[PDB]
Amino acid sequence: EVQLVESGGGFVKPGGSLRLSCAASGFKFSDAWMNWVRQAPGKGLEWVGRIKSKADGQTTDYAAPVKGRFSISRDDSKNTLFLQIHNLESDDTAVYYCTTGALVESRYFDWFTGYYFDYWGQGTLVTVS
Amino acid sequence: ELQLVQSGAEVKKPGESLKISCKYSGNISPNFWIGWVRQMAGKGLEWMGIIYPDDSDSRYSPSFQGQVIISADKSITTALLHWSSLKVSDTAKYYCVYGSGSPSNWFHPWGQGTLVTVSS
Amino acid sequence: NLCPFGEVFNATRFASVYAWNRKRISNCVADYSVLYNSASFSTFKCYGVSPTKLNDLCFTNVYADSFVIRGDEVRQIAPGQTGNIADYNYKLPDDFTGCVIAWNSNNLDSKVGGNYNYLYRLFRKSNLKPFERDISTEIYQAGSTPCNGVKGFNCYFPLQSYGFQPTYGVGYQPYRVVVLSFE
Amino acid sequence: EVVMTQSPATLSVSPGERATLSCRASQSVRYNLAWYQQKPGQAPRLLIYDASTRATGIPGRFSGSGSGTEFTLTISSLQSEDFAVYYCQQYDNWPPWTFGQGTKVEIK
Amino acid sequence: DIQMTQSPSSLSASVGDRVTITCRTSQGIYNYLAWYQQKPGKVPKLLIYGASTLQSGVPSRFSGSGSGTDFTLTISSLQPEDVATYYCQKYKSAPLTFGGGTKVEIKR
């Protein structure tokens, strides 16, 4: 049912930066953990980062070949996620997704922890020319 | 919460470091933030950031490159604004605004008449 | 030779709900109409004692406990109620005899752009006991598989921040609480 | 960030006659706002806040209006000391606290 | 940095037959792992989690079996509408690294 949509892809040129977005629809998005996954053309998937819920730190966990770049930030009050591609070299030409995962509750409170990915967006395609 | 006074600045050379000095008067509230606002030549006002003098936090709006807001003292009860080597763009006039808790009567003492910083 | 009540109520900064402070008062003169006849206290209700009758009652010891909790959560401060505070943070035995005070302290604790200095527990294996508190921050266990100090799956850090903000709704606005227990 | 658009850019009015002001927001600022006044050559002065309640020591001719994403300021008696530039400012959704643009009220 | 392999890559048998897929691991993970299915030119879809739990609303011909250090996912009988690439994901903690990926073709 619940859906996520992303936008911001373009036919950009290397040696710069780009900003990608993802807007939630029906979560309790204020407190959930969200992820980005980038599918290169004709290759397997690859996780690229997670951002916490800002009620539990608002921390970012990037990947091993990514740590230097690909900043992630969250904008509440409008249910929007933000991926900041700090620098494009050649291989950022791929598709990007914004996904979330498991729902966990103890007695009172529940939230999408985002560990195995259930809901995916349509996926925007980024290019480097 | 009473009158604030600022130190009338003048021209500088291409970028160096400056210090802009607001003041206090007294009868201050427990929550005590003081902010800094700037006005281009004949344009609208743009916010910079605020500082809580006790247990300074200095939260910045996302323009913090030449924006180091530190009270740095209660000795003379000031809220200095500091930067180093800013060159041509920030020729403006900077106001210091008072505030408190209980979000009424924040923006009442809104500086007095303020600092025409000349860069070039 | 009056009691130091003032420094408890006019204190500078309060502790967190999961790490509440405790103070002992004994061999002192305690007056309450000064506390009772105050318009500051938005909420003030007692148990087992008439609020006007305090001056006629002597006790061996008086214990004062204080913390800071969310606004629409004071109802959990009552003997025999449920909720996060009443389960994992602060418990009140049903044989309670003392007064409970709470007033809005928005202009003292909340700060612009969030205030991340106040916490509260969210996970604990078993409920608390009356007048009992814990401080340990061991990673919670939610399944049969032990993880041994890694915050992966089914292993959650059991502390979250309130994040107060002076423009929130009155339901979420902070509240200071002082709890009195008697002999 | 929310853009605090203000219309009209200028508002040419006659003395005495009532004059109105309008400020626009991108999304919910439901009850946090303010209205300044900056006579040229000096610092802006707060007029109202909370979108309805007037400040202290101000004439009773000013009155707040609106809520949500639409607001309005109304002046009932244009004297010789009311033609200035008026800014609207939110004070929620902290990181970008933003102002408006201004309406140079003039005469004819 | 727990390396995983999803082997082999070229798998194909006549419809109705049985297939083996093996997500080996370099370090032990108790049962924490999932499986994703992705047909050409579309978003991946979930099948399993906990290494054996079928998704509510997926065909029940997939058999999450193993646990410990080596896992297996096997299709009980083959059909020509279930040709895709399958992805095994480590799931204990960060950095949630996916698997290599295995495509399934069909026989002559």
Numbering used by the authors:
A (entry chain H): 1 to 129
B (entry chain B): 1 to 120
C (entry chain A): 334 to 516
D (entry chain C), E (entry chain L): 1 to 108
Mind quoting what the paper says about this structure?
The SARS-CoV-2 spike protein recognizes the host angiotensin-converting enzyme 2 (ACE2) via its receptor-binding domain (RBD) to mediate viral entry into the cells. In addition, B.1.351 and P.1 carry the K417N/E484K and K417T/E484K substitutions, respectively, which drastically alter RBD surface electrostatics and lead to immune escapes. We also solved the cryo-EM structures of two binary complexes: BD-667/S6P(B.1.351) and BD-804/S6P(B.1.351). Together, these cryo-EM structures provide detailed structural information for eight SARS-CoV-2 B.1.351 neutralizing antibodies. Structural analyses suggest that five of them directly antagonize the binding of ACE2, whereas the neutralization mechanisms of the other three do not depend on ACE2 blocking.
The BD-821/BD-771 combination highly resembles the BD-812/BD-836 pair. BD-821 binds at the right shoulder of RBD in a highly similar manner as BD-812, whereas BD-771 binds at the left shoulder but moves further towards the neck. BD-821 interacts with neither Leu452 nor Thr478. Compared to BD-812, BD-821 covers a considerably smaller surface area on RBD (595 Å2 vs 788 Å2 buried by BD-812 ), rationalizing its much poorer neutralizing activity. BD-771 is slightly less potent than BD-836. Like BD-836, BD-771 does not contact Leu452. Even though Thr478 is part of BD-771’s epitope, it is surrounded by two light chain tyrosines (Tyr30 and Tyr32), and a Lys at this position could promote cation-pi interactions with these aromatic residues. Consistently, BD-771 displayed potent neutralization activities against both B.1.617.1 and B.1.617.2. Aslo similar to the BD-812/BD-836 pair, BD-821 appears to be able to interact with both the ‘up’ and ‘down’ RBDs, whereas BD-771’s binding to a ‘down’ RBD is sterically prohibited.
